[PDB]
Design a binder for this molecule. Sequence first.
Ligand SMILES: O=C1Nc2ccccc2/C1=C\c1ccc(C(=O)O)cc1
Lengths: 271, 8
Amino acid sequence: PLESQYQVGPLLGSFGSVYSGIRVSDNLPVAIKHVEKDRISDWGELPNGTRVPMEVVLLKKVSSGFSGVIRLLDWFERPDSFVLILERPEPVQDLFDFITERGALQEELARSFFWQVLEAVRHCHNCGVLHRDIKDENILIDLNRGELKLIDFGSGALLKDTVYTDFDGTRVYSPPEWIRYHRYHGRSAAVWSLGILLYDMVCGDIPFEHDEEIIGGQVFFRQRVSSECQHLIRWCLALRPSDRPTFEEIQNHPWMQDVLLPQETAEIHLH
Amino acid sequence: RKRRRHPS
Ligand SMILES: O=C1Nc2ccccc2/C1=C\c1ccc(C(=O)O)cc1
């Protein structure tokens, strides 16, 4: 019984149905996420053949213990819904609100955050999972540990090397081949969204709001940004997918060198 | 200028 193991609190987040909670067994803070069956896009089968939302399949595949992706602790099926018990770091703030309040981030801080997101996305891919909705809204900052967590696998898919023709992530983070042709490959689409995210961090908001900007191929910098950072962003935002860097090329890029540790990041920029 | 969230 779910009503027995957890103390449920008020709504959580910053739209959706995620509630604050505490696990009674040990007062562990949790996030209790409800997903209505009639609203589920993709379904998956578990090992025992039980039909679950794909989000549960993907969360189980990444739930090893690497701290950069949100951990699914448990889940329950109800007549009309599924309930996901997720870890809840505290104190946290999502990266969207963090950037809103602080404006464009110092490049040392953006480098630390971007590096952690890259490591989290690599973990997903290594576990066979494509997130498909990388954006600042889906990134939580543990303000005491300086550790970022990727959340909300509700738009994700199993990672494959063939073409994707479906998409339900965030359009202003989606790549021009999706806008133009309704198709994309997983890794190069992820790199595009990471380019959007990095611009967001160093400029204080995303570069594109309209389809014509997404496909237009021009990146205007509204804030002072180093030449090395600009180059990496423009490379991630290459119009042709095959022109975009691999994850290895991103992390070997000159702008990415000498990253801060999470604890250094917390002490320098968050405390 | 207006910064906003974007639904999925
Ligand atoms: O404790 C929390 N504070 C938050 C603030 C903004 C967004 C999310 C959270 C949050 C937890 C959370 C964690 C995971 C998900 C998810 O996988 O969909 C959703 C919400």
